């Protein structure tokens, strides 16, 4: 029940790195995974991987385990059950195949067999 | 499981509190172990102690629940109440934050509650009366 | 484009009507040993959960989706159709502790 | 229904009275809300008001009629008590004119659903020794 | 049966004296009948009758054992707390000498039926979840 904004739409070219945010708000941040999800120009939506805001662990697709720098921060609590976090995207080999516009996403639930379903998510970010 | 303790899941899921519900009925009435200042003041409390326990058993006793941690019931619930999923609640929201959202309807549902064993007594004694 | 969940390529529909999008594939990502969740995606846009576990609509959503997992394929139905229903539909199979294997999409049109 | 209230039957038929119970059961020991005159003289009627009440309930607890507000027991009812028809009772005199009547043999009646409960769990407990 | 009174068993067999629990049960908490010595030390006597009363209570509702005057559980005899004969205990020793051999043991018997009712109202809630 809260905004998970984004940062620009930033441009660069391949070989390079590109960092992209996720600040979040209306939700306790620790209580849920945060996936980041991409549909680009040449296939349609791919899942990348998510991570856990308390656990601190993470677990990606194998396609990329080896190009993904994916960390967050830790919440500042505004009250009881709202809180205001922070998750952070990077690649590492870059080419123009990764085009396309990217998101952040909060998961679904706190237990059972849908944890880290993404639920929530973001508004978008256009790559190169 | 794991012996979280008193109230240790207070920040967890509806879903995994409910299944350490022993672990806060015992500390609720602790136990056992004269005209000073804490003196009074500890008997004052200790009456209170009981009082508080007592209403939550009488509260208990006249809904049939007398006895029990988890207790299921005829009341069936309102949308009104909480037009919520079965999912997005016990595997999401904790205790806390749903005593929130209960607040104003949690004394309607106290009435419902009582009447509703009344009404199971009362036919109970029908069905004994052959 | 190498998604190995196949759907239903595209298809077409009218007002008041009701619609069915097919989501298989082979034994490794299908389907009575996974859940199946779909998902509303406007092109390059922001996406929303329609389904999660084969048949569980997410809060909020109308009760004209629907859901269906037989041991081969899950479908998603559109009952009565609205015409802001003009999207693309995506599914994905997973389980408790592994990630979404979407789907290749299904472009819904209600001209009507 | 008519909600007639705290005590609101005391002049009304024994079955009418007998189908409202729980409001009685909720007033019994109401609830919550430090050495002056009403100071100490509060706290001697707040403790009063649980041992009267946990009376009640042990005595509840001792017959089988623990959570109880209509209860059937084993002990047949003794013509020497009340040689009265069942339908010049319940829908004729009141709880009241009932007390009167009934005070002499109710200490009797009080010992005979004692043992009639300690000879049913004592029975149940050869039922379940197999 | 022999009206032995309160505690006319303490020296006689377990299997006798569990007989006669509703005799000791009803004198636990006796009953009914300002600032000066007594006084106060009365009102200290009369708090601390219901306190010991009510967690004796309280243990006997968190074992599924409310209302019960002889309960039985899940739990299985261990061994190691006494590995005596059936016939060696009802038909001999007293229940004196009973809580002496189980004084130790006595605290984790005491937390195993506690799990053993809550894994029991969680089975019974999926039992009736449909
Ligand atoms: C405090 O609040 C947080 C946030 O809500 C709680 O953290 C969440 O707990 C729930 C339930 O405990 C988690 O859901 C489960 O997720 C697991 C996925 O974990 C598996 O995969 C992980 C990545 O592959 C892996 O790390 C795990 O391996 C162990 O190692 C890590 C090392 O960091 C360790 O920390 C883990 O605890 C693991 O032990 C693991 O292999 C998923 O498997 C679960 O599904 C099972 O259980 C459900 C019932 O719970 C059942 O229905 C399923 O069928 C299946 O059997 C379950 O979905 C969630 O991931 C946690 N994190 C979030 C939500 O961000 C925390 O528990 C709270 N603690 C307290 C004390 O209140
Ligand atoms: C829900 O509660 C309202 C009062 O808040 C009542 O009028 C209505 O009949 C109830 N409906 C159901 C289905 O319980
Ligand atoms: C309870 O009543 C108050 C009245 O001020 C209202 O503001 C609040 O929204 C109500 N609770 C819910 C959950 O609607
Ligand atoms: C009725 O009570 C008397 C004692 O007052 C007793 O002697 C008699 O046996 C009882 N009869 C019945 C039928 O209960
Ligand atoms: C109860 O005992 C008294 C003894 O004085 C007697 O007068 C009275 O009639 C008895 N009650 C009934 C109902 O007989
Ligand atoms: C008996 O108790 C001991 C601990 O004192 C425990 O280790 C053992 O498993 C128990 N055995 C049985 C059969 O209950
Ligand atoms: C209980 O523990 C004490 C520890 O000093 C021990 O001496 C005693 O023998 C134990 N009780 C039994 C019945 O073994």
């Known amino acids: 029940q809260g905004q998970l904004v984004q940062s620009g739409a930033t441009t660069t070219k391949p070989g390079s790195s590109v960092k992209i945010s996720c600040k979040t708000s209306?939700?306790?941040?620790?209580?849920?995974?945060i996936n980041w999800i991409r549909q680009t120009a040449g296939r349609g939506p791919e899942w990348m991987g998510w991570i856990s805001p308390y656990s601190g662990d993470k677990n990606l697709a194998p396609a990329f385990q080896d190009r993904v720098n994916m960390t967050t921060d830790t919440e500042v609590p505004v009250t009881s059950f709202t809180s205001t976090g922070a998750a952070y995207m990077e690649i590492r080999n870059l080419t123009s195949d990764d085009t396309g516009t990217y998101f952040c996403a909060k998961g679904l639930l706190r237990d059972g067999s849908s944890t880290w379903l993404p639920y929530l998510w973001g508004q978008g970010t256009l790559l190169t | 499981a794991v012996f979280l303790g008193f109230l240790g899941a207070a920040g967890s899921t509806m879903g995994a509190a409910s299944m350490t519900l022993t672990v806060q009925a015992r500390n609720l009435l602790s136990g056992i172990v004269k005209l000073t200042v804490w003196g009074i003041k500890q008997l004052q409390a200790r009456v209170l102690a009981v009082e508080r326990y007592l209403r939550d058993q009488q509260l208990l006793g006249i809904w049939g629940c007398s006895g029990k941690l988890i207790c299921c019931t005829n009341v069936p619930w309102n949308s009104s109440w909480s037009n919520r999923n079965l999912s997005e609640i016990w595997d999401n929201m904790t205790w806390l934050q749903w005593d929130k959202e209960i607040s104003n309807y949690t004394q309607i549902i106290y009435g419902l509650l009582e009447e509703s064993q009344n009404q199971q007594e009362k036919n109970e004694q029908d069905l004994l009366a052959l | 484009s190498q998604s190995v969940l196949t759907q239903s390529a595209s298809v077409s529909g009218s007002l008041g009507q009701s619609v069915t999008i097919s989501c298989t594939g082979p034994n490794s990502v299908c389907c009575s040993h996974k859940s199946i969740s779909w998902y509303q995606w406007p092109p390059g846009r922001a996406p929303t959960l329609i389904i999660y576990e084969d048949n569980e609509r997410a809060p909020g959503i109308s009760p004209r989706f629907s859901g269906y997992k037989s041991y081969w394929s899950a479908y998603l139905t559109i009952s009565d159709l609205r015409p802001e229903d003009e999207t693309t539909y995506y599914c994905c199979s997973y389980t408790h502790n592994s990630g979404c294997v979407f789907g290749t999409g299904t472009k819904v049109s209600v001209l009507g | 229904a008519v909600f007639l209230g705290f005590l609101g039957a005391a002049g009304s038929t024994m079955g009418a009275a007998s189908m409202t119970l729980t409001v009685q059961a909720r007033n019994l020991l109401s609830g919550i809300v430090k050495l002056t005159v009403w100071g100490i003289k509060q706290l001697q009627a707040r403790v009063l008001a649980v041992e009267r009440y946990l009376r009640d309930q042990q005595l509840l607890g001792i017959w089988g009629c623990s959570g109880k507000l209509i209860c059937c027991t084993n002990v047949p009812w003794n013509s020497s008590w009340s040689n009265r028809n069942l339908s010049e009772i319940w829908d004729n005199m009141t709880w009241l004119q009932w007390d009167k009547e009934i005070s002499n043999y109710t200490q009797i009646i009080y010992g005979l659903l004692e043992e009639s409960q300690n000879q049913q769990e004592k029975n149940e407990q050869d039922l379940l020794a197999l | 049966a022999v009206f032995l009174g309160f505690l006319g068993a303490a020296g006689s067999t377990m299997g006798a004296a569990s007989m006669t629990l509703t005799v000791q049960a009803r004198n636990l908490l006796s009953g009914i009948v300002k600032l000066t010595v007594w006084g106060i030390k009365q009102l200290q006597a009369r708090v601390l009758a219901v306190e010991r009363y009510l967690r004796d209570q309280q243990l006997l509702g968190i074992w599924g054992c409310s209302g019960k005057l002889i309960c039985c559980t899940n739990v299985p005899w261990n061994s190691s707390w006494s590995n005596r004969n059936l016939s060696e205990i009802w038909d001999n020793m007293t229940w004196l000498q009973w809580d002496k051999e189980i004084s130790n043991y006595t605290q984790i018997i005491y937390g195993l039926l506690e799990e053993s009712q809550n894994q029991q109202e969680k089975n019974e809630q999926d039992l009736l979840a449909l």
């Open positions: 209306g939700y306790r941040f620790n209580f849920y995974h």
